[PDB]
Design an enzyme around this catalytic site. Structure first.
Site, mmCIF file in Angstrom:
data_model
loop_
_atom_site.group_PDB
_atom_site.id
_atom_site.type_symbol
_atom_site.label_atom_id
_atom_site.label_comp_id
_atom_site.label_asym_id
_atom_site.label_seq_id
_atom_site.Cartn_x
_atom_site.Cartn_y
_atom_site.Cartn_z
ATOM 1 N N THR A 43 27.698 -37.511 -30.731
ATOM 2 C CA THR A 43 27.148 -38.035 -31.907
ATOM 3 C C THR A 43 25.967 -37.489 -32.354
ATOM 4 O O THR A 43 25.213 -36.642 -31.478
ATOM 5 C CB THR A 43 26.603 -39.614 -31.578
ATOM 6 O OG1 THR A 43 25.572 -39.831 -30.579
ATOM 7 C CG2 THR A 43 27.838 -40.664 -31.237
ATOM 8 N N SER A 44 25.643 -37.494 -33.638
ATOM 9 C CA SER A 44 24.467 -37.122 -34.027
ATOM 10 C C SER A 44 23.171 -37.532 -33.322
ATOM 11 O O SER A 44 23.041 -38.800 -33.334
ATOM 12 C CB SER A 44 24.391 -37.424 -35.551
ATOM 13 O OG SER A 44 23.168 -36.558 -36.257
ATOM 14 N N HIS A 61 22.253 -33.999 -25.632
ATOM 15 C CA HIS A 61 23.111 -34.683 -24.739
ATOM 16 C C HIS A 61 23.072 -34.110 -23.388
ATOM 17 O O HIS A 61 22.848 -32.870 -23.133
ATOM 18 C CB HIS A 61 24.656 -34.668 -25.319
ATOM 19 C CG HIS A 61 24.656 -35.475 -26.730
ATOM 20 N ND1 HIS A 61 24.270 -36.670 -27.012
ATOM 21 C CD2 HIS A 61 25.065 -35.065 -27.944
ATOM 22 C CE1 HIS A 61 24.266 -37.097 -27.971
ATOM 23 N NE2 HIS A 61 24.867 -36.055 -28.781
ATOM 24 N N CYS A 94 20.725 -37.232 -21.238
ATOM 25 C CA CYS A 94 21.301 -38.263 -20.309
ATOM 26 C C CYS A 94 21.656 -37.396 -18.982
ATOM 27 O O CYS A 94 22.060 -36.189 -18.884
ATOM 28 C CB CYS A 94 22.570 -38.740 -20.800
ATOM 29 S SG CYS A 94 22.348 -39.069 -22.515
#
EC number: 3.4.22.56
Lengths: 119, 94, 141
Positions: C29-30, C88, C130
């Site tokens: 995702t963006s 990410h 994350c």
């Protein structure tokens, strides 16, 4: 914040409030901090006609939340056939995986939705 | 001849504990980076770096909680994780 | 002495890798709001007299190449090194636009024997990413 109101009206199944907010320019791809979109909410809560009006106005059919769940995953979990049908027509990716490595197909096996396992 | 470990004098300031999601807001940015910049602005002239990062931990742990329209994701918490192999105190004003 | 020497002519580099958009193929995702982080970090660190270089949307190869080149710069006039990673993640992993990079691979460039102009100097890696998908439910206090 039109975006938040829309997410709220969608969760609540308020098809008229959904419509008014959209007419007022509400982003159909609004997101909470977990990536939850109106389409995710409508698909999970079984709001078929809201699912349709979101998809008509450019809701991202393949958006995923922070656990990689797409609207197709969520519709699959509750077993809503018509919503699954509509999502697939708008080009939902049957081969998109969530966090647990589980597909919308894989959920249909787990919950034994014999009728869901084909489309 | 005296040596130090090749791994010495690194600090890894993680936004989150191992295993965990790291929360961000579309408008204000990530909880950790918001808190890190705010603590550096207030304390870089006053506190050693580890003590700055500990205020960052407290700020993230106490001032933030996730909001989500899906209960699975709602009211979640975050602690950052300071990993120090530093051998000295770090003061920016020095 | 108890404190790092910080009165070198230059405070050091602050390298920011700001990954917002990821190849469709990866399905990532963006990352909305990462630009707010990147600007906030640049302001904060330039105010600390760091030399801020900001890099947007790097592939896994570009990150490794970036870090290799930076580690081979002359840091002898610099007190420290800062690298901020905004992307990410998974445990031990940061994502380039096209796929995963091993964090240990990035940081090994700056090891005491491999980046000799930073030996004895603080090397600070700030990692906003994350480390998995676990959620902390918290406890009332």
């Amino acid at each position: 914040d039109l975006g938040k109101k829309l997410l709220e009206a969608t969760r609540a199944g308020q098809d008229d409030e959904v419509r008014i907010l959209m007419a007022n320019g509400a982003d159909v791809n609004a997101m909470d901090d977990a990536g939850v979109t109106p389409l995710h909410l409508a698909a999970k809560r079984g709001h078929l006609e809201i699912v349709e009006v979101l998809l008509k106005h450019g809701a991202d059919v393949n958006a995923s939340d922070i656990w990689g769940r797409t609207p197709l995953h969520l519709a699959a979990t509750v077993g809503h056939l018509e919503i699954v049908e509509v999502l697939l027509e708008y080009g939902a990716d049957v081969n998109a995986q969530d966090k647990f490595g589980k597909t919308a197909f894989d959920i249909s096996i787990d919950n034994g939705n014999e009728d869901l396992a084909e489309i | 001849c005296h040596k130090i470990p090749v791994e010495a004098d690194f600090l890894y300031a993680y936004s989150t504990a191992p295993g965990y999601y790291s929360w961000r807001n579309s408008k204000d940015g990530s909880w950790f980076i918001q808190s890190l910049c705010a603590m550096l602005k207030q304390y870089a002239d006053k506190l050693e770096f580890m003590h700055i990062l500990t205020r960052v931990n407290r700020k993230v742990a106490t001032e933030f909680e996730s909001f989500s329209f899906d209960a699975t994701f709602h009211a979640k918490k975050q602690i950052p994780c300071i990993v120090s192999m530093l051998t000295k105190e770090l003061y920016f004003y020095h | 002495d108890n404190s790092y020497k910080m009165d070198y002519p230059e405070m050091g580099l602050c390298i920011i890798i700001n990954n917002k958009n990821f190849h469709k193929s990866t399905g990532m995702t963006s990352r909305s709001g990462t630009d707010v982080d990147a600007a906030n970090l640049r302001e904060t660190f330039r105010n600390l007299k760091y030399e801020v270089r900001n890099k947007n949307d790097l592939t896994r190869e570009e990150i490794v190449e970036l870090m290799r080149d930076v580690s081979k710069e002359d840091h002898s006039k610099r007190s420290s090194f800062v690298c901020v990673l905004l992307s990410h993640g998974e445990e031990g992993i940061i994502f380039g636009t096209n796929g995963p990079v091993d964090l240990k691979k990035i940081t090994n460039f700056f090891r005491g024997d491999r980046c000799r102009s930073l030996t004895g100097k603080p090397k600070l890696f700030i990692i906003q990413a994350c480390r998995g998908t676990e959620l902390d439910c918290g406890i009332e206090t």
